[PDB]
């Protein structure tokens, strides 16, 4: 099993997943720590969702006789404000699309449809998340940073613990 | 209404399904009768899964105004030891892959995506079964035949009746 | 070990069952596909019943140290109308009675009563089905083909989907 | 009154049942006492099966106005190893088939079908036990004695008490 | 079509059933009327038991393209005391055995096992009812008629109302 | 290892149990067959009671490294009337007392209290069964045999079927 | 007040129990610690059983105005392998039988039956355990040490934590 070009694509996406997991998780802990507890819970969920992706890819790789790469993490764009965090996470998302769109076509050319369908679902998921992040940035401009941030705390406001 | 080439492909796969069902079911009966009753349940489930594929393909053929071929069987490979059975069953699965991979691409070129999607699912499924069979053969080597077989009996060993 | 003439008879019946299963299942899919969904469900159950028979004969053969023949199918007679299907299915059934009636007598001469009882039960089942099939034909003449067929669709008429 | 020859056959089979009951029960206790507790439970069950057979024969005999023989026990052959026990038990099962096969034919010649059916059912039951026993012997050769034996103990191994 | 000789035998037995049904039912009404209400309930059930037999035979006859005879009835022998009733009912039962024993052998000679099995089951049933009747007569002699009769009443004694 | 004298005594008692089991069970089938269905259920239970005794002794013998004797059976005395049956069963019981009383004292002399306690419990049980049997015989004389027998039937009387 | 020789015997047994409790509990912790967690659980229950015995003897002593000796322990024999542990635990057990058997006889001579019955029950318990221990050693020889040990671990193997 396992076409070297497909395996390499899968492993590169896996590296991207482990990056997203760490980045998203930390951001959610920071949001929590700042008092934005309502938002933190949401961001945390996205993190576990990438975990699910990572596992799905790991499985595909193992089935294909490859060795999953758990050694390499990508760069970490840690935001110091809500807006920076949204933008940072958006940036990871666009890169996934840039890589997976052409990747899918190749998988099908290489006659590996199972890998292709896997990546098609991930694209579908990522498009939704990208939309969510872009909508939040639009909301910040429409409402104002303070007003938007107030919708991110509880009543009364709390902290990480 | 359905493309003649797509229909010949579906009928080829259908024939392959009927062959697999008989082979898998008989193997399950033999394993059962040999005393390997735990394993036999697993193989039995596999033949019922193939029946489900046979029905799905039949549906597709009929919808395309084709005639499902229920007259033709391929050559059964009956193993006379556990290892032979895993290897015989493995042989059918690869043929399935070798056939359906070019077939899916063809179906999409003919713009029949519903038939392509049906075969995409079947391929996904067979890959999981191949991995299962290939793994059983690996375990026989790692554990040794006798030790592996002891894991396929109940406590205490039964008989099948 | 089982007597060779008994095993041959058992295997001949097994070939008959596999044929019947295919014929009946295909007929039920066709009936379903024509819109006769109420009838289709009934014919489906008949093919699963022949499955039950196939497994029982397989067990008996295996117990007698025989090798169950799953490689050979008989000739399918596929009907292109309801009446034809009833007549085609009836042809298999009379065929079984013709084979089994002398067969039982012989099984008992060879002092294999357990095989005899198995075949006695199958004969009893087939007589009931033959009666069913003959009654449907009788009803088609009495009601008329149209009126009869109307009793085989749901309200409102539906399809395989 | 019953035919004296049928009555003599029934009493003869009754003696065989009483023998098998003793032999099977003792073996089960010995297996229990050796540490083979999972196997013991199975052999104990077979012992109560023969008890039911013994009762049914007693009934038939009484109905036929004869005297059931509870005075005579056959020759017990008691195994000192598992393999010996399977062989000893199999030996007695073969005698049954040898006595009952011609016996049934004659019952029917004597026009006593109720007695014949009772014996037909017994033959059916013993063929399944013969198969179970022969399969165990076959498993001992395939797995080895120790490995097979270990499938007959509990985890952890225990004792009769 | 059934064999004409088998059909004749079946209709003879049916005539016997209808006779037994009327006789047993009337005897039970008379026993009830005399005050023997406990016994009457038992005899009534025997009467419905023959009804079931009558229906089974009717069914078989119709499946064989025969015409069930519901016009001919046998001669009732109606007892005027408990003992006479038992002796009268026993007389029908023996006639059933005298006719069915040879009948079964013939049915099997004609290739009709289903009719034979039906009759085998009836012989088994009547054998049990004969035993019951014979046992009651033995009890009357052991207990004396007065003492036996007292076991057939309720506490306190009642009537058909 | 148990003391050889204790082992001999245990096997003697076991032989007695097996004799009692057969005799009591047959007597109960005969009582049932005669119509004495209420009494039969009682005798049947006594028979299973001795089975429990037989198993306890077997267990003790095996724990002491002995070989249980399941080959030797005593002489059955089978009664042809109720009174004979009670007298026949009572005769076994007295023999048990005659053997076990001295037996217990010896067991304690040999340092084997567990075997002694087992036998003490059996003596207690048989003493109660002797009382039951002796009481039934006294009742036959007080009531008369006919009147006593009437207490052993159901209302209304039935049979073994 | 209790007899001085009885009290001494009771206290000697109490010292035996405290020793056994320690030895068995430590063995179970060691077995648990080696990975034989299934076996460990069984050995633990045995030490709690000896606790039960220790308390009963304490009660009896106190009732007889004695002073229970909780200051003295016997010599622990700690095994460094499974087989050694079984043999070490067996050594204590034969020791108890040797002490208790003559002891009981004496208790009864001193006319202290309640103390005698207490010791009779302990002897009965120990015989069962001795059988258990002897059977495990017997099974180690039959299966082999490795195969036997494998039956003492969970799936998958685990540890004391
Ligand atoms: Fe992603
Ligand atoms: Fe995402
Ligand atoms: Fe498939
Ligand atoms: Fe599959
Ligand atoms: Fe059939
Ligand atoms: Fe059918
Ligand atoms: Fe038997
Ligand atoms: Fe058996
Ligand atoms: Fe009848
Ligand atoms: Fe009747
Ligand atoms: Fe007893
Ligand atoms: Fe008793
Ligand atoms: Fe103790
Ligand atoms: Fe203990």
Author numbering:
A (entry chain E), B (entry chain C), C (entry chain D), D (entry chain B), E (entry chain A), F (entry chain A), ...: 2 to 162
What does the paper say about this structure?
Safe iron storage, detoxification and appropriate delivery of iron for biosynthetic functions in a cell are carried out by a superfamily of proteins known as ferritins that are widely found in all domains of life. The Mtb genome reveals the presence of two putative iron-storage proteins, namely, BfrA (Rv1876)–a bacterioferritin and BfrB (Rv3841)–a ferritin like protein.
We have determined the crystal structure of selenomethionyl analog of bacterioferritin A (SeMet-BfrA) from M. tuberculosis and carried out in-depth analysis to identify sub regions of structure unique to Mycobacterium species. The crystal structure of Mtb SeMet-BfrA has been determined by Molecular Replacement (MR) using the structure of the recently published M. smegmatis BfrA as template and refined to a final Rwork value of 19% and an Rfree value of 23% at 2.5 Å resolution. The crystal structure of SeMet-BfrA additionally demonstrates that SeMet incorporation changes the electronic environment in the haem-binding pocket of the protein leading to demetallation and cleavage of haem ligand. On further exploring the shape of the electron density, the break in the density advocated that the porphyrin ring is cleaved at its γ-meso carbon position, resulting probabaly in the generation of biliverdin IX-γ isomer as the main end product. Moreover, since the mass spectrometry analysis of Mtb native and SeMet-BfrA crystals was unable to provide a clear evidence about the presence of biliverdin as the haem degradation product, this ligand has been designated as ‘unknown ligand’ (UNL) in the deposited PDB. The best temperature factors and Rfree value were obtained when iron was refined with 0.3 occupancy in both Fe1 and Fe2 sites. A close examination of the di-iron site in our crystal structure reveals that this structure is compatible with the reduced form of bacterioferritin. A pore, termed the B-site, is large enough to accommodate an iron atom and is lined mostly with negatively charged residues Asn34, Asp66, Asp132, Glu135, Thr136 and Glu139 and hence maybe the most likely route for iron entry/exit to/from the Bfr cavity.
